[PDB]
């Protein structure tokens, strides 16, 4: 979720994703670790059997038949990590994530507590203000006239420069905000 | 279960219907039947506030059991003899109903048999 996507996935990416998905579902079917190790080694052997096939039509046909095999043989209730998109704790803490701009609306009595925190916040705000034009300039110069082909962003190439469009990535609330 | 199998799979006309029963008079074979006795009066049962389903020929033992439970309240393990007596009376009532079921079954298997045997001597 941090890397920019590409226009497509190559054959190698597709077969690797199939390998990982099939291994995860196999682990869902084989609850115990020794049985999982056995059948996962068998799965790896089955994948290695055609590791160096050079006929792209044949490789594509084999990958397609593998997909058809997986869809029929998938676990209807696969194991999901608790914070993964299908898990039981996927977006549980989103109600606690509060954007930092809300701090600007605190009453001065609220800001009277935490003086050091708000002095540091003022320094951060000044830093964000002072480097915006350089970041915009960098983006315009680097990008092609038609527009940007991909969502990849450039790093800071000078010394006193920050990477363009950094504020919202850096000031993410937290993963356990409260 | 057997009685269900013999009715639903065998000949149902050989066995009693639980809904339409009894179909024979209470004196069809018995020479002298004494009317079933009841101990608890209507007023006693009413005063006791027993359930309508509970007001069965076994009601006096249930009344005694309720009185014993109320009299020895903190000791909820004192009404064993009374509960035993009431359960025995209900067991006797149930075996009486089983006896009625068996009597109806054998009367019904005798009746059609005797008529078909009377028809058996009427072929010629």
């Amino acid at each position: 979720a941090f890397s920019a996507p590409a226009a497509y996935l190559t054959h190698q990416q597709k077969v690797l994703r199939l390998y990982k998905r099939a291994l995860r579902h196999l682990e869902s079917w084989c609850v115990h670790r020794d049985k999982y190790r056995y059948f996962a080694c068998l799965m790896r052997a089955r994948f290695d059997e055609h590791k160096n096939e050079k006929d792209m039509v044949k490789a594509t046909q084999l990958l397609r038949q593998a997909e058809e095999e997986f869809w029929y043989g998938q676990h209807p209730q696969p194991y999901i990590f608790p914070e993964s998109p299908g898990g039981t704790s996927y977006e549980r803490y989103e109600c606690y994530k509060v954007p930092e701009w809300c701090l600007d609306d605190w009453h001065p009595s609220e800001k009277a507590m935490y003086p050091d925190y708000f002095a540091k916040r003022e320094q951060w705000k000044r830093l964000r203000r002072e480097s915006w034009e350089r970041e915009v300039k960098q983006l315009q110069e680097e990008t092609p006239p038609g527009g940007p082909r991909t969502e990849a962003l450039p790093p800071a190439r000078k010394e006193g420069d920050l990477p363009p469009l950094w504020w919202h990535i850096v000031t993410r609330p937290r993963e356990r905000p409260m | 279960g057997a009685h269900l199998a013999r009715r639903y799979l065998g000949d149902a006309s050989k066995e009693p219907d639980p809904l339409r029963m009894p179909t024979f008079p209470p004196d069809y074979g018995f020479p002298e039947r004494k009317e079933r006795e009841m101990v608890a009066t209507q007023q006693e049962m009413n005063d006791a506030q027993l359930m309508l389903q509970q007001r069965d020929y076994c009601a006096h033992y249930l009344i005694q059991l309720l009185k014993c439970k109320r009299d020895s309240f903190p000791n909820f393990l004192a009404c064993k003899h009374e509960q035993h007596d009431w359960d025995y009376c209900e067991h006797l009532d149930y075996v009486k109903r089983m006896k009625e079921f068996e009597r109806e079954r054998r009367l019904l298997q005798r009746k059609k048999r005797r008529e078909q045997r009377e028809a058996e001597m009427a072929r010629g």
Binding site: D34, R37, Y38, L42, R44 | -
Partner: protein
């Protein structure tokens, strides 16, 4: 807090079903390169475990001893 990881050289698949997996995979011309990583699930206090019926009778012995002593006491005390 203030604790570090046990040595990684102690995790041997020896004596565990991971050995059986290794032999079955060797009889097929393959190897299992992740077995030792699972070894800790069979090593320490996890080495042995109870069966279903033994779990069901978790406190049967002590309760039975108390039951028999109570019956023995009351049966002879009831002969007043």
């Amino acid at each position: 807090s203030k604790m570090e990881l046990p040595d990684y050289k102690q995790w041997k698949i020896e004596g565990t079903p991971l050995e059986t997996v290794q032999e079955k995979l060797a009889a097929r011309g393959l190897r299992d390169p992740w077995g030792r990583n699972e070894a800790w699930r069979y090593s320490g206090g996890f080495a042995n475990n109870v069966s279903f019926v033994g779990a069901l009778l978790k406190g049967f012995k002590w309760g039975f001893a108390a039951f028999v002593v109570a019956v023995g006491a009351e049966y002879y005390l009831e002969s007043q």
